[PDB]
Design a protein around this ligand. Sequence first.
Ligand code: SF4
Lengths: 99, 232, 247, 55
Amino acid sequence: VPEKEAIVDNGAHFDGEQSGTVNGVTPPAVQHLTAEVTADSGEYQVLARWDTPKVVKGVSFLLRLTVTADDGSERLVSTARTTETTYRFTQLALGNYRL
Amino acid sequence: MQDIRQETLNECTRAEQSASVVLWEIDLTEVGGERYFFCNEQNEKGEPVTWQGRQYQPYPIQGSGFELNGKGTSTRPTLTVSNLYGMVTGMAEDMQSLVGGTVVRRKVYARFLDAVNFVNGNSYADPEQEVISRWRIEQCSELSAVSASFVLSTPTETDGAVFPGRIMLANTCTWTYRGDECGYSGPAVADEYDQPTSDITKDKCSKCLSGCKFRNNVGNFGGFLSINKLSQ
Amino acid sequence: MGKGSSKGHTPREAKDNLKSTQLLSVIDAISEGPIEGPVDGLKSVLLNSTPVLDTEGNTNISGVTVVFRAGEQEQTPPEGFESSGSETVLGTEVKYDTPITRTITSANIDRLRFTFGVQALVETTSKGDRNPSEVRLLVQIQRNGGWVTEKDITIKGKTTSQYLASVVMGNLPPRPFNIRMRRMTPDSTTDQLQNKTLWSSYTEIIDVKQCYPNTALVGVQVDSEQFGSQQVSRNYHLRGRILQVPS
Amino acid sequence: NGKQNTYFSSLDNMVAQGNVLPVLYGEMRVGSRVVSQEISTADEGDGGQVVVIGR
Ligand code: SF4
């Protein structure tokens, strides 16, 4: 049956999104990230709040707190990994902090 | 015990009995063919054997390997038939080698045959005296210029089957188009390549999500359109 | 509580101080064809190894929304599960005198989610200290000619920065739509009481359109905070197939 | 370790791709084939009219 070959290399109509549905189950950016400097407890504390985006099979969060240098560069103050949607920072020196 | 009439049981115990005639029927109606009736012998008048008013044309045919065993492999009988004059050949090129057809075998004592078969008639003629067995054609094992051998199998034969059979897939529908589970009854929309068509004879589903959307049948889509990302 | 569908819904415990709530939405597939269903009810749903309802009816776990589906050929999709969302940001303040309105008038929407909130909620007094503020807002639909209230929301809290919430609703009439959200509290006339409101954005939800024709799905929608960082292992004490048994 | 499994039960939430759909025949406590599992933010307010966020 030499005429079989023509049928074989006629693959069906795959739907689309060949690149992988442009997600790669990569989590979206966290939303509503608000920092709050308060002293109602008698000392300076920073409360950080955020909302979980739509993820797959579960989620965790990575926090990176850095402080601005005098020359415009940055210094790594702290790093953390959590599962909660809130965090608390205490005993922070004066400066401009980016979380 | 088999449900066979008292006359056959009476004949089985006799010391001197009549010849046991085996009549065969090939039923290809379910596979798009016709029904053929065969007997290994003619009658005393040189005519095809008439059983229950139906003529069974003479043709060299012989079956072997018939047994009833529950333990072990399912029994696979064999049926050898004459291929002189290229008759079975003509069936092999028209019915896809007869595969999927039915073979019906009747055992009848010659004393119960129809009266037309005998010159002097049959006073004990009884059309209700027969033993029937049904099988299916599995493979035309050999076909030559002389003969043809067929492998038979019980209709159940759980050989290639699996259980459970329905498979969980994404981007593909496992239902049968316009079937019960698919539940589609609309007009012609597109072919298997999603190209729109108003031709009913060219209306098929691509089994993809786009093919289902073409018919607005996404509710009845047989796939699971989220599992592709949880399996990583 | 029925055959072919169920609702469960043990209520959620009231929160104390604002805060968000992580939600775990699962859909579990079991069996084929019409099945009888749960052995008892909501006591047959085990979230890790514990039934939702104690043997006396007490709720072991609060915040569960099991929605059982049998294997009937003619089913309906499990409600409350989203598939895609379209978020449009319209962050503006909502004053007492002026409502907002946006006239979404889409075509393929299923549910509407409102992202409202307050920029601050402190009630400062002379010499210092702070107190809650009691903000109230109202979300209304066009409903032809009469703006019928859909969801009135009251917020109590201290806060210092922006806080955002969300509210979902359905039953949407056809779509020459007009939505609205307006303020109830009078205004922040003084400087020591800041209770400004805000309508950040709204989202259009399309939900799950695939009513899986012959499987038996469950769906949970349990809050994931009560359980630890470990994953939730759902178990079900179901009954089996509806057989073709001799009459 | 030493656990014995059978061919007629499962208390696990197995992967549901290319894995067929199970069949349950009467009673039994069962696992599942997870079809969807997403973690999001719960929206306050369930039904009715009145919604209170903070108490
Ligand atoms: S994809 Fe939709 S229309 Fe096509 S066979 Fe499946 S259910 Fe039917």
